[PDB]
Amino acid sequence: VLSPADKTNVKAAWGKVGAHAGEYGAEALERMFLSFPTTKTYFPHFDLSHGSAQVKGHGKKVADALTNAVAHVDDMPNALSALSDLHAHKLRVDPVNFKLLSHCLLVTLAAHLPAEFTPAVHASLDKFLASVSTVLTSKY
Amino acid sequence: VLSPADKTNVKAAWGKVGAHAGEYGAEALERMFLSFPTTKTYFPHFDLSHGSAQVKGHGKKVADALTNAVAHVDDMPNALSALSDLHAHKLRVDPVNFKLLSHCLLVTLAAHLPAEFTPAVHASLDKFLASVSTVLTSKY
Amino acid sequence: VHLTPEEKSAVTALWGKVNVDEVGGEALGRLLVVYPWTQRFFESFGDLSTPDAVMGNPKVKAHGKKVLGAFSDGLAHLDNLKGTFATLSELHCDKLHVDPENFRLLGNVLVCVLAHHFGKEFTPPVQAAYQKVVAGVANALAH
Amino acid sequence: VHLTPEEKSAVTALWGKVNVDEVGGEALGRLLVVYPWTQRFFESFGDLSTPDAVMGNPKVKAHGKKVLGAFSDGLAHLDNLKGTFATLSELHCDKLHVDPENFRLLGNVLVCVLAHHFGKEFTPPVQAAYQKVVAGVANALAH
Ligand code: HEM
Ligand code: HEM
Ligand code: HEM
Ligand code: HEM
């Protein structure tokens, strides 16, 4: 699916993210929780505060999973096997929620990489997040 | 994606279809045209009559493509390469239309195989038609 | 919606032959088999792991009988669906937090069940009328 | 929709700093790059093959300027969106035959463009208000 030019734009974009991955993933979860409130029902045990601790740690863990998905961009069904067994069997997340977070991730990158977010990078990152969302629902 | 039990139900279901593939694909296109009328805009050169000739021949050609997708159930991106270059580049079909036809295909099978259409066969054929719809949009 | 009176005759004429108990629980059970994430909403119904224990779960059959109760109320009120399903859109969108895409899925599953119980009696105009009904019920629960 | 008056102050306060020409054609051009099947609706606009000839096509710029004309009319009429977009829902759903999912896509693309032009000025409550606006405009064009 992903062309090597798209993998160039994805690896370049997360390369420009770098060490701010926990802040961007925490930002994206705050955007999903505050704009799309039904996803708050998947987290009945967190404190979903505007700058909380479990939202920031879970944002760091989501973005570490996305970084390992970037480094395994052609090995996604095997590098995301425990997560796809987590989100599909144990948590049973509706797949359209994986669209919503994907959108918020793009908004986060568009709010924090205003030079690197060209429409080729937007299209490549949208293919990437739709591919990660495809792997995370692939046990359905 | 497709388990060997799902491939058992898909190959068993199209095995029970057999020679009625042109009638079932023509039936499914008549269901998509009559129930979901915006898909009629993809066919501005056909006679979209209730039992026409180009609808029946195109139904036979769609169902021959589906039968070759059944016989190549683990070789779908290479056995459906010309069609995925057709529907994505040349025709530029909205992917949600590939959902609609998939639904009508199930309705057609449910209207014509009332014994073989168990919920495992319904789930397996839904995974199959979502996989064929995934291949036919994979050049996006 | 706006069904033509021939399509009202096909909706009413076909719906008068619909068994309540089989079509309701069969439709909901085919949600829980075909679309398994919907099983997170029915965590109190006991076993929903294997498809035969989905299609033999008594709570799925009784709850599906409630669902065709609501579709029957939707067919007696084809003009005032927004008025009819207001309590149920409040219940599904405020208490249960169901993403409205799922309602569309159940509607399509119901149409498959209708084909599975009527065959050649379920023509493309009857299906077109039931897709108008199904989209009316789904959009009516979308509030 | 039903924006709180603080969210009306964030929608209005942020929208008062939106350049029309860049945000409109940039949003429509990012539809035609990210979601290429939408390019079947703009077959008269000349070259839409390469992304740089999508983002440099003058008809995409002027037409996107019309699209933000429609979003501006949507922000001056937040209560009567069903009344405002009736001609445009007739034009998109009767003449052009656009599947309403696409409208949602453009709305999300517009929100990305807003983030791309405001950064830290585009907070999660401002985005939540603009997702309410975007879903209001998309549901208003869905008729
Ligand atoms: C591209 C999208 C996503 C990625 C990469 C991702 C990644 C992860 C990771 C790394 C974990 C923690 C696993 C561990 O404990 O080691 C997790 C758990 C979880 N995810 Fe996701 N996730 C994604 C999308 C979503 C979405 C869209 C939702 C809900 C609407 C969601 C809900 C959850 C929940 C509830 C947990 C359980 C962890 C807890 O609550 O303690 N995830 N995911
Ligand atoms: C879901 C599985 C589908 C399959 C297997 C399929 C298969 C085919 C085949 C075999 C052809 C003839 C091309 C050839 O023989 O090389 C074709 C053409 C075409 N298909 Fe599909 N198709 C599918 C879905 C759709 C959908 C959902 C639409 C539109 C809403 C669509 C629209 C068209 C059009 C417009 C043509 C061109 C007709 C012509 O050239 O006369 N197809 N497709
Ligand atoms: C699209 C048409 C639908 C109709 C007409 C419908 C109908 C109903 C009705 C009438 C009730 C009330 C039951 C009662 O008061 O005892 C109900 C409750 C419920 N519905 Fe639906 N429903 C629909 C879609 C869905 C879908 C798609 C899901 C899940 C994916 C769902 C999940 C539930 C749940 C979890 C309950 C509560 C169960 C309980 O109270 O024991 N509904 N529904
Ligand atoms: C919230 C979403 C949208 C809004 C507010 C909007 C607004 C408009 C406006 C103002 C016009 C011009 C009407 C006129 O000049 O009389 C228009 C026309 C048009 N729209 Fe949209 N639009 C939206 C979404 C879309 C989408 C998503 C597509 C395609 C995938 C699309 C395709 C078109 C086309 C092809 C035209 C006609 C072009 C022409 O007349 O030259 N629109 N829309």
Residue numbers in the entry:
A (entry chain C), B (entry chain A): 1 to 140
C (entry chain B), D (entry chain D): 1 to 143
Task: Quote the study's own text.
Here, we expand upon our previous results and show that biological specimens amassing <100 kDa can be resolved to better than 3 Å resolution using similar imaging approaches. The resulting reconstructions possess well-resolved density for bound cofactors, metal ligands, as well as ordered water molecules. We further demonstrate that conformational heterogeneity in specimens of this size range can be discerned. All specimens in this study were imaged using a base model (i.e., excluding imaging accessories such as a phase plate or energy filter) Talos Arctica TEM equipped with a K2 Summit DED operating in counting mode using the Leginon13 automated data collection software.
Khoshouei et al. recently demonstrated that a TEM operating at 300 keV combined with a Volta phase plate (VPP) and quantum energy filter could be used to resolve human hemoglobin (Hb), a ~64-kDa heterotetrameric heme-containing protein, to ~3.2 Å resolution. Briefly, vitrified Hb specimens were prepared from lyophilized human Hb (Sigma Aldrich). RELION reference-free 2D classification yielded detailed class averages exhibiting secondary-structural elements and various recognizable views of tetrameric metHb. Moreover, the results of our work with ADH and mHb demonstrate that small-molecule ligands and discrete conformational states within a single sample, respectively, can be resolved using conventional SPA even for smaller complexes.
